Design a protein around this motif. Structure first.
Motif, mmCIF file in Angstrom:
data_model
loop_
_atom_site.group_PDB
_atom_site.id
_atom_site.type_symbol
_atom_site.label_atom_id
_atom_site.label_comp_id
_atom_site.label_asym_id
_atom_site.label_seq_id
_atom_site.Cartn_x
_atom_site.Cartn_y
_atom_site.Cartn_z
ATOM 1 N N UNK A 70 0.790 -1.064 -0.059
ATOM 2 C CA UNK A 70 -0.004 -0.146 -0.061
ATOM 3 C C UNK A 70 0.856 1.215 0.112
ATOM 4 N N UNK A 71 2.090 1.065 0.469
ATOM 5 C CA UNK A 71 3.223 2.116 0.509
ATOM 6 C C UNK A 71 3.552 2.711 -0.955
ATOM 7 N N UNK A 74 8.952 3.128 2.786
ATOM 8 C CA UNK A 74 9.210 4.204 1.536
ATOM 9 C C UNK A 74 9.862 5.340 1.871
ATOM 10 N N UNK A 75 9.858 5.815 3.163
ATOM 11 C CA UNK A 75 10.526 6.940 3.792
ATOM 12 C C UNK A 75 12.079 6.550 3.528
ATOM 13 N N UNK A 76 12.365 5.499 3.903
ATOM 14 C CA UNK A 76 13.802 5.108 3.894
ATOM 15 C C UNK A 76 14.247 4.916 2.424
ATOM 16 N N UNK A 77 13.475 4.231 1.674
ATOM 17 C CA UNK A 77 13.992 4.158 0.168
ATOM 18 C C UNK A 77 14.233 5.642 -0.404
ATOM 19 N N UNK A 78 13.536 6.500 -0.119
ATOM 20 C CA UNK A 78 13.628 7.922 -0.544
ATOM 21 C C UNK A 78 14.748 8.737 0.066
ATOM 22 N N UNK A 101 13.979 20.755 -4.206
ATOM 23 C CA UNK A 101 14.334 20.137 -2.975
ATOM 24 C C UNK A 101 13.103 20.103 -1.852
ATOM 25 N N UNK A 102 12.458 21.199 -2.164
ATOM 26 C CA UNK A 102 11.072 21.362 -1.549
ATOM 27 C C UNK A 102 10.035 20.335 -1.607
ATOM 28 N N UNK A 103 9.905 19.902 -3.000
ATOM 29 C CA UNK A 103 8.952 18.947 -3.356
ATOM 30 C C UNK A 103 9.566 17.639 -2.755
ATOM 31 N N UNK A 104 10.920 17.336 -2.706
ATOM 32 C CA UNK A 104 11.465 16.108 -1.950
ATOM 33 C C UNK A 104 11.114 15.787 -0.410
ATOM 34 N N UNK A 105 11.570 16.946 0.214
ATOM 35 C CA UNK A 105 11.313 16.887 1.830
ATOM 36 C C UNK A 105 9.977 16.919 1.810
ATOM 37 N N UNK A 106 9.082 17.361 1.155
ATOM 38 C CA UNK A 106 7.751 17.501 1.487
ATOM 39 C C UNK A 106 7.105 16.022 1.313
ATOM 40 N N UNK A 107 7.739 15.262 0.292
ATOM 41 C CA UNK A 107 7.357 14.004 -0.121
ATOM 42 C C UNK A 107 8.027 13.023 0.870
ATOM 43 N N UNK A 108 9.057 13.188 1.497
ATOM 44 C CA UNK A 108 9.546 12.268 2.298
ATOM 45 C C UNK A 108 9.005 12.422 3.746
ATOM 46 N N UNK A 109 8.475 13.724 3.936
ATOM 47 C CA UNK A 109 7.222 13.828 5.248
ATOM 48 C C UNK A 109 6.332 13.232 5.053
ATOM 49 N N UNK A 110 5.305 13.548 3.884
ATOM 50 C CA UNK A 110 4.340 12.769 3.792
ATOM 51 C C UNK A 110 4.299 11.163 3.887
ATOM 52 N N UNK A 111 5.357 10.586 3.513
ATOM 53 C CA UNK A 111 5.545 9.329 3.613
ATOM 54 C C UNK A 111 5.725 9.094 5.096
ATOM 55 N N UNK A 112 6.282 9.898 5.813
ATOM 56 C CA UNK A 112 6.385 9.679 7.351
ATOM 57 C C UNK A 112 5.288 9.942 7.954
ATOM 58 N N UNK A 113 4.583 11.079 7.565
ATOM 59 C CA UNK A 113 2.873 11.406 7.936
ATOM 60 C C UNK A 113 2.366 10.045 7.990
#
Length: 193
Positions: A2-3, A146-150, A128-140
């Motif tokens: 689902x990730x 997935x967050x590790x992968x990223x 960089x903003x789109x990336x950090x925002x995506x890593x967070x969402x994954x953490x969220x």
């Protein structure tokens, strides 16, 4: 899984898009289980495979017609088929650091003829903003693998990839096919030798 539900959203369309932008003799990197090759063959393209993992080369030899060539090389070290018109890969180029990505493109620029293309589909970020925002969402969400992968793999930004392609004689266009993946269509500007 689902990730990775969103990472693989429109998976088929993604391979379709890469296929439709390729011609003549196709050199595919990161054949994996042969999904891209499969559509490439269906499209009547002449294909040469590359995949370092023996585990993967097997599954592909299983699904793809026999006779299909698939060497054990990789993005930087591999057997040159003969006359390559277009070099492709999906969900693989991020296994290379940005410096290696530059060596790879520099090398494909050396092998392709004027008009030759590089079409890669892969997870990449606008900035960089789109990336950090995506890593967070994954953490969220509960997405920890997935967050590790990223933060482990070598995902990069569109502008960086932009400079590499052009610095190596290419004019590239980026088309987004999902929140993570973008298809980069590159055409060599000058002729070989």
């Amino acid at each position: 899984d689902i990730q990775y539900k969103e990472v693989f959203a429109h998976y088929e369309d993604i391979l379709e898009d890469v296929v439709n932008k390729s011609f003549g003799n196709v050199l595919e990197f990161g054949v994996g289980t042969g999904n891209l090759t499969n559509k490439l063959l269906l499209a009547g393209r002449t294909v040469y495979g590359i995949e370092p993992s023996r585990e993967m080369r097997m599954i592909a030899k299983e699904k793809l017609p026999k006779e299909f060539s698939i060497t054990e090389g990789d993005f930087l070290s591999f057997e040159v088929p003969t006359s390559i018109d277009t070099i492709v890969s999906t969900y693989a180029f991020h296994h290379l650091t940005d410096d290696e990505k530059n060596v790879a493109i520099a090398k494909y620029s050396q092998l392709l003829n004027k008009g030759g293309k590089i079409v890669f589909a892969d997870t990449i970020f606008a900035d960089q903003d789109a990336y950090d925002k995506t890593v967070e969402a994954a953490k969220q969400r509960g997405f920890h693998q997935l967050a590790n992968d990223l933060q482990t793999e070598y995902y990069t930004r569109i502008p960086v990839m932009q400079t590499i392609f052009e610095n190596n004689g290419f004019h590239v266009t980026f088309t987004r096919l999902n929140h993570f993946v973008w298809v980069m269509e590159a055409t060599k500007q000058l002729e070989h030798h």
